[PDB]
Design an enzyme around this catalytic site. Sequence first.
Site, PDB file in Angstrom:
ATOM      1  N   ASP A 155      -5.225   5.849  18.159  1.00 50.27           N
ATOM      2  CA  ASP A 155      -5.883   5.595  16.881  1.00 50.27           C
ATOM      3  C   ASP A 155      -6.260   4.126  16.691  1.00 50.27           C
ATOM      4  O   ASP A 155      -5.791   3.462  15.767  1.00 50.27           O
ATOM      5  CB  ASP A 155      -5.063   6.115  15.713  1.00 50.27           C
ATOM      6  CG  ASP A 155      -5.822   6.037  14.378  1.00 50.27           C
ATOM      7  OD1 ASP A 155      -7.084   6.017  14.380  1.00 50.27           O
ATOM      8  OD2 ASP A 155      -5.156   5.984  13.311  1.00 50.27           O
ATOM      9  N   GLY A 215       0.812  -1.241   0.000  1.00 54.41           N
ATOM     10  CA  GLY A 215       0.000   0.000   0.000  1.00 54.41           C
ATOM     11  C   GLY A 215       0.838   1.280   0.000  1.00 54.41           C
ATOM     12  O   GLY A 215       1.889   1.320   0.632  1.00 54.41           O
ATOM     13  N   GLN A 216       0.375   2.321  -0.702  1.00 56.42           N
ATOM     14  CA  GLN A 216       1.093   3.614  -0.794  1.00 56.42           C
ATOM     15  C   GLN A 216       0.247   4.793  -0.318  1.00 56.42           C
ATOM     16  O   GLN A 216      -0.397   4.715   0.722  1.00 56.42           O
ATOM     17  CB  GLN A 216       1.596   3.885  -2.225  1.00 56.42           C
ATOM     18  N   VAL A 247       3.971   0.666   2.332  1.00 53.70           N
ATOM     19  CA  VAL A 247       4.208  -0.601   3.017  1.00 53.70           C
ATOM     20  C   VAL A 247       4.549  -1.733   2.040  1.00 53.70           C
ATOM     21  O   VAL A 247       3.746  -2.061   1.169  1.00 53.70           O
ATOM     22  CB  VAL A 247       3.010  -1.037   3.891  1.00 53.70           C
ATOM     23  CG1 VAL A 247       3.254  -2.439   4.447  1.00 53.70           C
ATOM     24  CG2 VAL A 247       2.778  -0.066   5.044  1.00 53.70           C
TER      25      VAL A 247
HETATM   26  C1  LIG Z   1      -2.274  -3.846   5.494  1.00 59.22           C
HETATM   27  C2  LIG Z   1      -0.889  -3.250   5.201  1.00 59.22           C
HETATM   28  C3  LIG Z   1      -0.435  -3.335   3.738  1.00 59.22           C
HETATM   29  N1  LIG Z   1       0.120  -3.751   6.171  1.00 59.22           N
HETATM   30  N2  LIG Z   1       0.577  -2.928   6.968  1.00 59.22           N
HETATM   31  C4  LIG Z   1       1.459  -3.439   7.809  1.00 59.22           C
HETATM   32  C5  LIG Z   1       2.023  -2.566   8.751  1.00 59.22           C
HETATM   33  C6  LIG Z   1       1.062  -1.835   9.467  1.00 59.22           C
HETATM   34  C7  LIG Z   1       1.391  -0.861  10.422  1.00 59.22           C
HETATM   35  C8  LIG Z   1       2.732  -0.582  10.650  1.00 59.22           C
HETATM   36  C9  LIG Z   1       3.698  -1.277   9.912  1.00 59.22           C
HETATM   37  O1  LIG Z   1       4.967  -0.915  10.215  1.00 59.22           O
HETATM   38  C10 LIG Z   1       3.378  -2.262   8.935  1.00 59.22           C
HETATM   39  C11 LIG Z   1       1.535  -4.811   7.467  1.00 59.22           C
HETATM   40  C12 LIG Z   1       2.219  -5.955   7.894  1.00 59.22           C
HETATM   41  N3  LIG Z   1       3.073  -5.904   8.916  1.00 59.22           N
HETATM   42  N4  LIG Z   1       2.004  -7.126   7.258  1.00 59.22           N
HETATM   43  C13 LIG Z   1       1.158  -7.212   6.238  1.00 59.22           C
HETATM   44  N5  LIG Z   1       0.474  -6.152   5.787  1.00 59.22           N
HETATM   45  C14 LIG Z   1       0.639  -4.960   6.383  1.00 59.22           C
END
Ligand SMILES: CC(C)n1nc(-c2cccc(O)c2)c2c(N)ncnc21
Length: 247
Positions: free
Chosen positions: A119, A19-20, A23
């Site tokens: 949050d 996601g942008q 991540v």
């Molecule tokens: C849903 C989103 C793309 N995502 N955020 C993630 C994170 C969410 C919040 C903080 C992060 O550092 C990373 C994440 C993950 N650890 N594993 C799989 N998908 C993840």
Amino acid sequence: AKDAWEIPRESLRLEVKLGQGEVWMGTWNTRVAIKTLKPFLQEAQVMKKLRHEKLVQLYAVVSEEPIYIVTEYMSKGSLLDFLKGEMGKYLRLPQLVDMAAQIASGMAYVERMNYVHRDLRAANILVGENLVCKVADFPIKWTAPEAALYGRFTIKSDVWSFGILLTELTTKGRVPYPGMVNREVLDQVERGYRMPCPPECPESLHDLMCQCWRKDPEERPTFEYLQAFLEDYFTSTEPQYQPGENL
Ligand SMILES: CC(C)n1nc(-c2cccc(O)c2)c2c(N)ncnc21
């Protein structure tokens, strides 16, 4: 400068965009998630001090722009996506109460530890295999009035959001207060309005929501209370529970 959480950017293979900042899913040196921030240290001390089973685990940082936060990989994305996906229609109260329980547990730890999330809502909960849920990421609709209006953020405001999160779980991902824009919510929750009981959801679970949305922060339950209540739910509260068409 760097603390023992520091790793070198070279040790990380970014691969799938998720996601942008952004991540990415990746590799070390071990499958991992990398959060990246578009071009800081003090306000990352939070995630380094809190280790627990129902909170997404930090692994390392790259403390040089562009910053990389590295964590365990959560195979099913946000709780919000999970509820809105294919899995939504197969979920029922057992599963949803259990997810709510794990969250409450992570949160009750944060409570012991004396922190505030700020949050808390399904977008910031992550789901793994076997319906493991983990609190992540340390807006009015999810916020307690005292915090939205006077900045009074405490574990008690986190409890409020938890109560809203329970409507997300029990409506299988629907935005709270259907039809109201933010101003109308703030105006109406001040006048005393609260969401009614979601279709097919037991009154006892909506009662727990209402204790969470008590106007006096101090009178809202503890997470430790929420955690046990949800854990013991189909024995101590709804022993006669039968599956409906959606819950
Ligand atoms: C849903 C989103 C793309 N995502 N955020 C993630 C994170 C969410 C919040 C903080 C992060 O550092 C990373 C994440 C993950 N650890 N594993 C799989 N998908 C993840």
